[PDB]
Amino acid sequence: SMQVFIKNRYGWTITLEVSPTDTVENVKQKIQDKEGFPPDKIRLIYGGKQMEDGRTLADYNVQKDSTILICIRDVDC
Secondary structure, three states: OOEEEEEOOOOOEEEEEOOOOOEHHHHHHHHHHHHOOOHHHEEEEEOOEEOOOOOEOHHHOOOOOOEEEEEEOOOOO
16 A cells, blocks of 8 residues: 645645556546546646656655645646
């Protein structure tokens, strides 16, 4: 098991079930399943860096119970 939290600019936070080896795109696909956002508009930021689709959570040193910030391109970024 590994949970991470996804927080938007309004403070709304959700929990995802992931693994360290999941890609950033895998996380965007989970957010589309849960909330309906199109992945190509989801921007994820960790440690102030915009996260690349093809890199893994472990490549960003995202830990269990880490928070990743979300914003929607052309909507609220």
